[PDB]
Amino acid sequence: GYFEGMLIKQTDYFRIYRVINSLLISQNADPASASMYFSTFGAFILQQHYKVKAVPKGGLAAYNLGGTVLLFADHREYVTGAGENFHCWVEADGWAIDFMAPAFSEGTDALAVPAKMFQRPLSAMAASINDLGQSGDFFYRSEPEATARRFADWHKQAMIGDMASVAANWFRKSPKQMAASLSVTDRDGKARTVPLTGEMLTGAW
Numbered sequence: 048g049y050f051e052g053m054l055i056k057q058t059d060y061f062r063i064y065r066v067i068n069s070l071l072i073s074q075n076a077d078p079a080s081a082s083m084y085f086s087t088f089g090a091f092i093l094q095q096h097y098k099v100k101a102v103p104k105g106g107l108a109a110y111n112l113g114g115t116v117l118l119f120a121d122h123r124e125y126v127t128g129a130g131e132n133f134h135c136w137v138e139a140d141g142w143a144i145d146f147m148a149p150a151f152s153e154g155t156d157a158l159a160v161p162a163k164m165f166q167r168p169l170s171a172m173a174a175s176i177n178d179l180g181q182s183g184d185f186f187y188r189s190e191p192e193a194t195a196r197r198f199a200d201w202h203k204q205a206m207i208g209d210m211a212s213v214a215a216n217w218f219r220k221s222p223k224q225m226a227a228s229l230s231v232t233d234r235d236g237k238a239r240t241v242p243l244t245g246e247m248l249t250g251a252w
Contacts, residue, residue: 053166054142055097058221060164061248063092064149066217069244070210070231078154079133082119082147083197086135088214089146093139095215101139105197106190108134108145110165111179112252115158117151118176125176127190133197136187143169143185149248163250183252205234213241 055063067088071081086103093101107127108119119134120126127133137144148165165185173179173186201207210231219225228242 054099054140054144055093055166056221057164057166057251060144060146060166061149062218062221062225063089064146064248065243065246066092066214066225067146068150069217069241070214072244073241077131079128079131079135079197081150082133082135082145085145085147085150086137087198087201088211089144090137090139091211092215092218093137093144096218096220097139099140101137101144103135103194104138104187104189104191105133105135105194107176107186107188108136109176109179109186110145110151110252111182111184112151112158112160112163113182115155115160116176116179117155117158117160120176127188127193133193135194138169141169143167143172143187148252149246161250162246162248163252165252167252209234 067085071084076084090101090103093099110117118125119128119132121128121132145165149162151160152162167183167185173184176186179186213229213231217226217229228240230238231241232238
């Protein structure tokens, strides 16, 4: 209670999630693509506002969330997802941060996954997908070749960099007072209003 020990305050983590979610929502992205935006835009915001090296990574990811294991992998003969089960996260200043975590309720049906922050030391990582016995446990296997290929066409898409710029400029550290909505201009020169999405967000894994 006497210092900020985590890389980012919980409330600011939620600000980041809210900003990225607000920019993405119109895109109706699949889970894998969504994680790519949460991880790259999150990393960019961390670089720009917190002055830490923050690196998006992807591959196989698994979490114990309140007793249920969420597994971003394909089952075969588990392996790294060849499709929509691929998942990205951020590694920054030793911290594992998954800015997508509040969105884990979607697509999990019976698992009834709550929306909470995921920000934990990488040094706390479990040994495997079979070592996830406690809520908040996580396991990652980076697949750098797969990650590189997944992102291969992103540099050709000017809109993505434009959205990242908007994200970094929308985010402010608490308590400074963020715009409720922004006017965003596309490459055609046309502007649209993008509002902050409106979920109430509490809790940490």
